Amino acid sequence: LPAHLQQTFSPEEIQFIVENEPIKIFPRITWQLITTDDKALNNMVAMRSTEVVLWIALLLKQQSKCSIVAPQWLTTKELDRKIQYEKTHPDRFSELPWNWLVLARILFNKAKDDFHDPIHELRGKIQDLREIRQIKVLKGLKYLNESHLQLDNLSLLEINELRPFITEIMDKLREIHTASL
Amino acid sequence: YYDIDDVLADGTEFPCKFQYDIPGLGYNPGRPITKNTKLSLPLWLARILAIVGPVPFVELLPPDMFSTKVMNAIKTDPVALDLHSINSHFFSLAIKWIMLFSEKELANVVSELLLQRAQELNHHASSTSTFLLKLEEMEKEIYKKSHESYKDTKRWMFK
Amino acid sequence: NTEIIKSFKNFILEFRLDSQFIYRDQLRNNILVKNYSLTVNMEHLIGYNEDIYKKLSDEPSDIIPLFETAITQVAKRISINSLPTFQLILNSNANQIPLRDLDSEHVSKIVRLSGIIISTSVLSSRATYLSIMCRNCRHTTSITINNFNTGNTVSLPRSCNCGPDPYIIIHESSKFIDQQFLKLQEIPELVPVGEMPRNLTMTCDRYLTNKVIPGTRVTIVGIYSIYNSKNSGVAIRTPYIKILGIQSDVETVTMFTEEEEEEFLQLSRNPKLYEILTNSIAPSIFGNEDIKKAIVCLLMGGSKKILPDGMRLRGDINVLLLGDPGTAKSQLLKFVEKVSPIAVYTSGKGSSAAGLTASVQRDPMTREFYLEGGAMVLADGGVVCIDEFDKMRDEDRVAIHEAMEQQTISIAKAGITTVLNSRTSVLAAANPIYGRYDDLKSPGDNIDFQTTILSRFDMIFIVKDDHNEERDISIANHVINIHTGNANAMQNQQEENGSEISIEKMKRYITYCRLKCAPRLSPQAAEKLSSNFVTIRKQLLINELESTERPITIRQLEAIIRITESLAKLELSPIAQERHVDEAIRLFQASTMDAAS
Amino acid sequence: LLRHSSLYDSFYYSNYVNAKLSLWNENGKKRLHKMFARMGIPLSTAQETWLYMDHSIKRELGIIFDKNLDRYGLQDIIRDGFVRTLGYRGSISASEFVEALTALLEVGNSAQKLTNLRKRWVSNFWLSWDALDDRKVELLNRGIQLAQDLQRAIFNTGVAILEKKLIKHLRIYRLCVLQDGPDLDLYRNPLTLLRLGNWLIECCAESEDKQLLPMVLASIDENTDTYLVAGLTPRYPRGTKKPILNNFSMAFQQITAETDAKVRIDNFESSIIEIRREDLSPFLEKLTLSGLL
Amino acid sequence: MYGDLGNKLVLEAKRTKQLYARSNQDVNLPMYHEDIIRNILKEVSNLRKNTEYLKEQQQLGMLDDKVAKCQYFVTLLCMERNKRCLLAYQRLRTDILDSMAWNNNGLDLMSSITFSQQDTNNLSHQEQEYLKEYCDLITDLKSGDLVDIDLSGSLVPPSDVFIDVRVLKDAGEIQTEYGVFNLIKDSQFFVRQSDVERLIQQGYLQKI
Amino acid sequence: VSPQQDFSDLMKSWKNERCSPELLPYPHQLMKRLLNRISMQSQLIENISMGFLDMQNESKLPLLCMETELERLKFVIRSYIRCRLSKIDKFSLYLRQLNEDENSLISLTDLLSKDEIKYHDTHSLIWLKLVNDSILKYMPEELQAINDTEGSVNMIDEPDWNKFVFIHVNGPPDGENEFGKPCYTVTIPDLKEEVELTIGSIYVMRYEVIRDLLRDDKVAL
């Protein structure tokens, strides 16, 4: 019986559904994992990719006997092609990794000393995308028709933030359209 | 719904009058009220007393200052307007009006209003003499729970 | 320069402390709500480079415009035309040389001051974007005038046979900025030998104007540039201050944060406010419990009813003291001046009582009259303080009768006759006919003739001079504690930090709790005061059979209903109670029998 | 505390450096106004003339402090030093940084009152250990502003007791009993007292070719005459050839064994003990004869 | 004009929500308005005796007039307009103490409902049979699940295993289970996450 | 029936509830397949830690990952059964009216488990014993049963049945039943044109235009 945050999600558990998706690591060390969703191995060979779930790997970096590899789109030489397909298209945003904003925040707290130059370069190439997305959403909701919108590439964070007002601000106008007759 | 907000919004008024003569007076002697007499009516009885007859007892006298004097004022510029000093609740009073009367004319004119008024309240939500806050009076439930959404979402996103 | 500019668009979009990224995250947050302004906070700027500061702090005007253009371009970028130019607000805290550096090195250098603004002026207009036409060939240009050396930065040129000055100022495509010419006065405590103070002049911009009312301490940062007006001997000029940021103290129009009332709501839940303020108001006053309760209800006030007909009820109180010298009737009054939001201290002589309300004069431009001064036009909401209600024999009585009980003056002089509003609250402390023998004779002769001034006031204390040989030694113990040793600076930091309230928190506090809750007394409590009053007039008329005359009338009875409304503003309850109202008459019944003695 | 504060303020504890030379109150404001007064110091951009404009002015100090080599011989100023930065937010060195930690350990808040006093210092200790990471910033400056007034506060009675002339050279040590001046309450905690002696060992840091013995002070604030008395160490004027440690703790075992009428060693450091008022006067009488150096 | 005091009742009912739900999670429920609800109980008392006079004359006097018919409606319609308010204030009263039936639904000294709102322990102790009922009806629901899943809080998701925790305002020896932690004054802890949830909601360990 | 498959379905069948206007059938069958599992793996790590106690008259990894995992899965069902209680409380007068007279739906085992209908009938009883003796002493003889006859119809239902919810379309691509041009989607409003979904585009809709397509989990929330 919370009665506090019931219609929506707090931002302390939208990260909880994305931490249970796997990425690739660089192992170091040599049964050990009977977690019922485990994929335990034997003596593990280094210099080899393996799709491991993220939350144990964050715990594995606390004891510091492994190293993460960045995903394939995490360089500044790669997001530059994203910022031109949108500047020519005020229609929508094209190509998104769908969980990007909650991914980088975990990947900067305690995952800063891993990749070659994330600091002073990547956060410039992120916060621009945090607003160019939301500049587009301000043009979007002014175009509100009846019971029909078109969102294509929206993050889990922004969909948790447009949510708690856009429901009842059109539900309240659903009365005067329907109950007129 | 145990109606925590709207029965007080149904505690408001209407000026209206009669078609017959009844000795039921609680408003003071001379118990038969003479007909065609203007009487202030609360919402709860008068919503159904204009229903029970064929020809009902009461006469619906429209408070047409809610129908001509402000309908052009809300047509002009919905960025700063009295939604408030004329109705402490504009909304459900507009709802329960349009059920009994069913006029499709002003059914359009608030459908333009609410998206335009909310067009402030989204993009105004990023972070005084006797009555004069009242421009921001009938918006309190509307946006304040959305204000706590943007507040805490920064606080996880930062340290 | 362009190179310099390249060194600011590349700096105010990636400056940050550790992962907060702040200056993009407020510029966006200031383009949604229309303000178009920055707060650079120059001491926080220094993290780039001391050189780029030093190209600023040694040379002016050029730096402000280059910075403004860079910010406008970044603002333009954070969008995709209706785009205005911005304005800057700088602030630092080095130290305030008060009014002493005048010409030596502080010409066109950044400076920080402190003063009290006294005199506002009406608004005006200067232009910032123009469109200019020629007579001969219908040429069309556009010239922007941003920053200043006042006018005559650059003039209209001659280029487009062709006659000179061929150009005109149309009014169809233009923008405008407003100036102020408000006048700064020195804070009157820090130039002490024997001299009168001086004054300067200052102008400003629209998005930081109308932020001051006269009667406040302000701190102010700006430039010391020089204009020259030809309406005195050597070719001289005049000084003035172009100002940048009034990052002053509070206003002393109710917008503020939420944590300011969080502790206030956490304090008001504790029901110990009324007994703790009597200690915590005046930390250097030996007791005086009955008077101390009256000052906190004077500062808060009641309400104002504009009930559905023409008339109204004067919802406020006005206390009055009188008593022997040496019994704190005077030194208490400087104490209420700092704690008030607005307070005026004209406490002497009445000061030519016609000049207390309003004054006119011949004005040098256009040889005209209008209305300029007054001691009551500036004191609305707050409280005035005066003294010596005996030896103002000329016209003090005729100047406060209309000023009180309706607060609606109108000047009948040579120009206007307008009923300007007033919501004032008066306070005074006088002397009887040398104190002692007045209280050892027939108990009249306090004000020598008139009772009509006494019936306009309601609450009257009368102190006296006993000879209690026990508590006085504690008073003689009390004064040597404060006067030297200064242990009350260390005692009222080791009893205050969990229990008492400091002197500056109340100035934060009273302006919030007045301007929010509109209270009303309890409707079933009306049986109490009506049953109370009918014996008080009987207690009155039991005395007049003794050949005794004078003063009690009905105006004090509608003052007690404001007194019980006062503590309801303190507790911020919208309804009153009976534990509420019985303590209020407990204060007044200790000043009902004063008419008997 | 220079890069935090105002090169002005040296105005107080440059007379400490002249207490490190010869003087504290008499002639200093007559003396100091040439060397540390290259201007009557301008307060126009002064917050960045000890931050930024000192690029030219403290480099002039870089060429003053070799022509102030001879000017008074005052060479307890040149030191190699060490510094840290942050990337932004201004530099902070490690000399002033230990000064903030000592002062912040102080403030930041029969015989039954001691429990509510013994539990205070442990609690305000805890709001300093957390101050070593960037997870807190905005209370590190609180110790900075509480640094440069408590030193003004501790001086405000040190100049009083020095002109009281109540330092009595008996035979070997010098006895000073601060009975009651003003502002007595800041001496319950012992960490201010060693600093007070650290200023008081330097007023007697003139030549003093004979009698190089430190002092013993005395103060009281509360009931039953607690009297947290303490001793100091003598100091060399940087010329240890003879590493003098202490002579008092040897004698402290004696008087805690002989009289045995309200003497205590309950406080932790052996250099600080407690004593009763009617026993502190015969305390020294067993000390003036027992020569244990 | 007739049900006027109910509008006054529901207006001060609104302030009970805005005090609690806007500020924080501590309830501090104001008061039950027995003085106020006795007035509407007084007015409904006269109103029910008003109709039984006209319930008596309807066979003897006007003989059930259509004019007299709607006279029963105005006496009817005032009842539910009153009956709407006098339970709406009753529900919003009792639907906020369920917080206390959930945040402190049994962690330590559960049956101690004391040192809490004793001045309004004529309000709530007179409704404690409901409170006790909820209490007992939540105890078996802690055991009606055939496997023991905790229901006493822990609503925030976990983050990791190791959390720096301080302590103050507490003394004595607690935590007889899961290893005794020897809780003494102003002591740092640096422990596993899963043992502190029954003390943070207790409010003995202070800061994360 | 792999345990990874037996968990990802649970997470999908938890998030969908958390913005639902009305109740869904409580899938008790899959819960009992894992109600044994949460007891077993606690018992597995119960004794296997004790063997590590008796080896000390090395490894710290394989204990820590087991301990945090199953309680994290225990956290999900901790919220999942409280929101049932947070929904069944208000809806009580409606669902008994669905359960009093015989109709198309019964409060079945796959609708509600044992303890909450033990909760519901008891709590609705003690609710009725608060309004009765403390308030409804002066209740006249037309206001006995708390349910709406006419006038103000709010003692009946939660007819919020066109509240809008964001939808994610996750149709399994097997063509199979292909109708549309990009993929097989359908819609039908009550009044408007039948413009519809395509593959995975996020939309907003009312509830009974989508209540049919959620019995078959081809489209998520």
Ligand SMILES: Nc1ncnc2c1ncn2[C@@H]1O[C@H](COP(=O)(O)OP(=O)(O)OP(=O)(O)O)[C@@H](O)[C@H]1O
């Ligand atoms: N009740 C009191 N408690 C503490 N101090 C008092 C009190 N009454 C007077 N004093 C002290 O008297 C000192 C000087 O007062 P001052 O000379 O202004 O008195 P005064 O104006 O003659 O008295 P009065 O206002 O009655 O004429 C002040 O420093 C004040 O502390």
